[model samples]
Target: SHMLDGWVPWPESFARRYRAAGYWEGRPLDRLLRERAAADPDRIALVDAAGDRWTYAELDRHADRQAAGLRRLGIGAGDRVVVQLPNTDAFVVLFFALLRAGAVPVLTLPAHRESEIVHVAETAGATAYVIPDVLDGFDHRALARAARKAVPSIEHVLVAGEAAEFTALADVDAAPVPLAEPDPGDVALLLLSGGTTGKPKLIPRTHDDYTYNVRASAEVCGFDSDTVYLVVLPTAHNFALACPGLLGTLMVGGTVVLAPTPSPEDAFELIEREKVTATAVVPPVALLWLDAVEWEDADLSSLRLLQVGGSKLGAEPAARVRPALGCTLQQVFGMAEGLLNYTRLDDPSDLVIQTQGRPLSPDDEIRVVDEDGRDVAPGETGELLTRGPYTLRGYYRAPEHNARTFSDDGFYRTGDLVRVLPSGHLVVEGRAKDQINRGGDKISAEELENHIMAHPGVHDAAVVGMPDATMGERTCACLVPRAGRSAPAQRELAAFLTDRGVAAYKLPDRVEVMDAFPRTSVGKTDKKELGRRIA
Candidate 1:
């Protein structure tokens, strides 16, 4: 395929200008927090479900106290702390505290059960595991016990609520610890990939990588101190954690109104209550809110910008919601591995609908490469690869994986099929890897199979994501039982994963017993047909 019509090379002059401006100066995430607190002491930094709110100064003080508490428990910089809590004020407090203590925070979704929790703790080499006593419907106390048994590295269990086996973090003071400052290149956060290819790989985000990425996002999305951001997505996810949420809000000194749940009623109420001007949401929630607002006398006039990412939002949905939700819709496409693309506020409506706009920062060099690693002509679909100052240098402790994912020249292979348009916009088609996105969480079918195959009653397993209107995708595990054994029920398997300490999001929602899977000529499972059959 040749270059698509209207394709133009990125301007060299513009790149040089950005370089001269020192746009890529590396800074630690902690420094950003300190600067924001000093400048905006009275500005609301976070608001939680129980109507409690903390200003930037208050958050900083509280984080210091929490850091002291963690340090008292022998947690310090370079240590790994597994945080499994819902979106609450406590979660935010503990997060910065870990950072202040120089510890690497590993964020896990609240939905994780015993199986996934243990796996993450073991793989991340967690020194401490922090969780709530209970959330939604899961009993976390039992889950923590399972994790302690599965992972030998975990030295402490810190619970949000009072528990016999876990220490409660509620009364932890706000006194700052005298910890050593982390190098800008030191890992600040560790995010897990949905293990779709094999096991979940750990993406080590340095202080510089995260801070610069968020600052770039804030600039790209036009966030400022006057922007009141309503946050409804998981704070642990890269989409919310870095851009258009916490990081963006911090960068611009904006107020963040947190929503514990994504219910339409709660979101609308929060938006109006906080006089929210901006918020980030996925397509599924946007559609639900669009439907919910149609019947009610909702006041969404305060909303100015609605940023959507984590999944595609088609033109029709974008158009329908812009007027219905009373906000200007912008599309963002980004990943924890580091390339960020967004539909600009001034872009034409067609571009907003059809493209995942240009790179947010000039530091990133994005290219569309064919299967052979040669650059594909603009507008021709190919795998996307990126090299940037803010992008991750390598996966934590995974040399072989890094070799495969990063190029000899340091470009990170994104494993996404996309097209770069003449207008400098990117259109994502799908994945080059056999991965499924379940509500912004990536899951590898092969990894799930490997976990399930370890079960005594299971002979073989195949996992696929089934379409779900709310979550985008739900996991479906298809298995062939051992001889003379009945296949375990769906609930049983879920409990199995829970007992094994699996994150709740990764557990299979549905289970099916199949006699055999169709194979390719070389004896590999034909996943395309499997996905089709499952769908």
Candidate 2:
């Protein structure tokens, strides 16, 4: 019984091998700026929406200055700085600056305002907050004010625009301070994870662990200096930061073109104008690019790869868009907490589009285990458990939850149900916490969602387990119908599910037609909010 049968051969010694040892050498991420500055001083490192470009040398100098400013404000090692900004050069500079200053960065998505931002800041014990003046018509100033009142630990509020008592980051051109050499075990980022219940939890990634994850992803994706990556996803999200965007691009000396908005027209224009070779985006953006008028005429000949994540891309969208997009569509399955699975360039088309490919690096160990914490037979469905150098050992300040979630052997319980095929590919069944229990029968929401999305009228669908007194839990389907088409009624949808061999109890009890689903900061369907709506 060979491991990874029907897939590419893995050397016996290659299994569970960490790749960061080659380049990282337990160094802090701050050293990347210096390396980039020394090697490619004139090369463009980052570009923003407003046509602003920063060369490697310029970005390094700016980050150093920002580090000095942060140190002046009494921010140093172990301090958590909440960063809430759009995809701009300032965001990039602040991100590296905090790392260079030996402060842990808590990256809050710009869309996360009101309670979400306040919850994260308070939980992480953030000392300072850096926010923009205004983003997409949201009054960040007012939000910042409210956040300060809610979270008393926040001592400093730095705004991007003019404001009283708030330091304007642009004006602070303090001289570069000496970089702090942090231990590899020190937490570099306090990334928030969207769990199935309650407020989001903070997952701290150490400098060594984060670097290993990024290097593993880069190696799996085969990034090189020639890779021109267009970053269309939120910079705050781990997917964009670790995989196809910042970290990978920085390691390979590639140019990153950041798109603040998810506008298809703007993306198309930029892709053609800059001759971008690769990009990471979500499924909704892929749909727009495939249907947009501008994309048909755009010179997308330079594009070679398109990676999609944040949520599952159904077969319908994948089949329809990949041929027209004229690039290899790679499926990315990862979470903020840790595990990453990506489709290789040489993978079969079906595997690339359908399943989340094998683990990126040899260091990561993945297993499909039954409820008893024992490994399941090949092709059997079970909860996914992963252990790796990149995986967080535990949640910050949540020892009880960590004990419940992580196995005694150190495997982080992902809470995701999946089936590992004999070929080493993983097909996500759904979330373990999201499984609908009706009359003692478990129903996979992802299973029902796949059937719902197969309908011609349905454009997007989310399945939620609504509380029911009689059955304990009933399934409810929220659907976004195709443009200019009305969604089918509950009975019609029920019949569709029935015809597709769905169990009677698995069928949705209520079907709600919607124009769009509520999204989180990283553009994933917010089932937590959906559950709240039903309540």
Candidate 3:
């Protein structure tokens, strides 16, 4: 047996502190679901989009059977599997099944295609890819095949349906194999970082730390047996998956309601039907819901809390949440790497609407520092740095990259510009990274530039964010046409990107073709100049 890689473990001193503070309980991630099942075997745990439901015991048994069947397919402890199921009950089943089988899942979105999927699958040394047979008109079987072909480490393609050339995971009838226990400190997931990069880094979340985070979040958001959570965002997102999300609801014997889409009509129907109490959405999605609620006559009385995250929600929109939808708006500013901030339910309305709240754990250390790594004065905006109970020590396998982003003292350079008030509320101002935050989705300038450069007439490209009203930012590309050739038209280039399998959101909305790019004194492409030109 040859396993190629693993994530860096937390620093010894901090690891000891985490254990001593009773944060990292000695158990695997699956323990949360299993414990709740044991305590409340008959409690309803989940309701899928189609209205199919599952009890805590049923969910646990299903995961156990699936894990055993997957184990027979040769997956086991330390193996990395790509899990790309949508927001369905199968997502719940497969997620736990992977951890139950001791295989780590590299969480991926339903919207991701070849360009995004191939890199991470190869990076994690993924041994298997688990996707539905078809989703939203995209045949995942082809993408799975491409991944398996591109990464020889990937040996199996498990599709949820009975499709040809792919194993039908629903047909798993193998005898349930006994579950194996992994060390609490072992990596549980390789969550994708939202940071914009040519290749996004894999965030290593341990069973102990991640499990602790879910528990703490559930407490902060006040999840209990009576809680009914609506999952309106892509299930793969860190905010939806475990920001006291499906996992947290199950932990407290609560019910999870899955929404097929984040469309206001769909969510309103689901909320009115299921009596959903709490849900999370990014800022842009929140705005749409607000717009929908204005005209759509639906009873939102059952909705208790709406947690806005991903990117900071504008204060004006945040202020309108309670007045419009009649729910307490809790702002969550967090990362998949582990640190989470939330406005308490009891906080003043102004703080809840204006800031993104405070750290979940008392032991969580947050610093607002200047470019020189020195602390900034209170109420002053600066780069945000944090090290805490559930945060990672470093990225999965890149030592040199980790050295630059992670401080010697173990604080992660969050790449976010933020300021902390005297009362400890974090106000997210902007980003320090060259990333276009379209609503809440981050589009990396470097990643987009590389994609644009693939066009035949393009010699070089630089991507920048242009101010946008409805969506936080718009993607604009400044291109240098190849000598003796004219650059392709914007429509043509967008089609080319679509052909290249880039996500629609990452495509350049506007293009500027130039003979050459403006450079700074050091001769690097001046993104500031690009921004100015686009503006």
Candidate 4:
């Protein structure tokens, strides 16, 4: 009776092949946790920043009862809920609970505010919005109120800490009862796109495919029962959530340790306390860790592997991981929409430090095509296009965008410029769009430009990425003030955008008031010249 409309399924022939090949496990995400709990109920499943540990049995029971509670609140099969929480035990419990209740959780970053949260909830037709009462000095309860005000479809605002006027997550209690199980083909969760263009798009991941995703990723990353994975990235990011992250650790009966912050002091202490064996981080955080090792006093002997991704790690810093931190470095290249490439655990130092590694699955089809759509020769840089067993066929409810993004043969336009080595490893050259990779967060230049242009004091604005040692790129906004009006100060523009509910990362790091923007031959804003002007 429950059906999630707008998600495109794989072709029947393709599905049959994946199923026949044992790639599609036909199991829901919740079932994986349940089976593990049934096998070894006392195994430690999670360790939060508060020093609270949850065993498989306890976690499973929490999921069951919370699933019951969500049902009592009228949230059940196929309903969508926008989930925004930090790294905590509650986040882990609620994730499984929602899956058990057969509700698709729209995973959102904690940094998201009214603009992002509202759009995500509205696009998914979300019935519920979950948040913490306050986090990092931001009142998420207020953000929840703003979202509910904007998206009337949001029927409930469930808060984690203290629900001032809304329902508290603690009150979502009910006796465990029989609940409907979603079909393996049902959209299991909604992952946000990197927002390369504008607002984020929802990527619908299926039960069968996402199950295979974590399983294969766990195998690739060499995660096992002994693995103690530390989560430093936001819990909602595709990198930290899966790609052998928290989900992969849980899948293999390993313990997941939640780091409250990616700060070197906090993460190092967690590694010392928890004996964390493996962890994932972006290039910026990896750089910080590498640098911090000189002054930090934590014993990192238990750390086995450090996987750095999100943005391409340059060769210089990539080579520093082992020498500085004493752990094997694994470079990851992946997206929420689909394909994951990883440097194998036993790969040579050159491959691990240089190339982004090979596709996770043999079934992952890759094409390096030129502008004319013809295949590029080996070692020639071109756009990466891929389709795979775990990759989504289309974005949820975005038919027009999908038509532009996917090839006629169903390959996803990855937007990454890359070259394939003889060993099948990918070497990322750059990105096709003007998206700034600030640490791991993606900020579309045009999207930020649009926001800057909204300021009454601004006539025209162009956002460009300036080179940076730590963040790889920092956003610089070049603007032209309206005739006879003074340009807004950098702080003024930032505060203006912040008031508009834009994420902090999307705000410009530097602002330059230009008399006029240099134009290309086609009269387009010559962003290259603008970047040069700022640089």
Per-residue lDDT of 1-535 in model 3, one digit per residue for the tens?
A: 1223556777788889889988998889999988999999999999987788999999999999989888888987789998888888878888888898889999988888888888888888889988998899988898888787788999888888865787887865456777768888878888987555677788988888888988999999999999999999888888988899888999999999999999977899899999999999988889999998879988989999999998878899989998899999999999888889999998999999889999999999999999888999878999999989888878887777788888888898888999899899899998888888888887888888888898989999988888877787888888899888999888999999987878777888898888877899989988888787766
After TM-score superposition, the amount by which residue 171's alpha carbon in candidate 4 deviates from its true location, in angstroms, is: 1.6
Q: Per-prediction RMSD in angstroms?
A: 6.2, 11.8, 1.6, 1.4
Ranking by lDDT: 4, 3, 1, 2
lDDT of each: 0.78, 0.75, 0.87, 0.90
How many clashes show up in model 2? 3
Off by over 4 Å in 2: 1-24, 293-296, 435-535
In angstroms, the error of model 2 at 180 is 2.3
Error of 1 at 297 (Å): 3.1
TM per candidate: 0.90, 0.78, 0.97, 0.97
Candidate 2, poorest ten consecutive residues by summed lDDT = 2-11
43-142, model 4: which lDDT tens digit per residue? 9999998788999999999889999999989997889999999999888889999998989999999888877888889999999999999899999998
Worst 10 residues of 1 by lDDT: 1-10
What is candidate 3's CA lDDT for residue 428? 93
TM-score of 4: 0.97
| Model 1 per-residue lDDT tens digits across residues 1-535 | 1111111112346335544666534566777778899988998888776678889998888888888888888887678889888777888888888888878888877776665667668877788998888788777888788778878898888888876767877865546658767776567788866754666777777675577788878887889998988778877878878875777887679887888888877888888778889988888887888789878665888998988888777677888867798778888888877788899998998898788778877667887889888998768999988977567657766777777887876778888899888888998887777777777767777777877877777898988767776677778888889778887888888777656656666778888888888788999887777888775
Q: Following a full C-alpha superposition, what root-mean-square deviation does model 1 have from the true structure? A: 6.2
Which prediction has more favorable TM-score, 1 or 3?
3
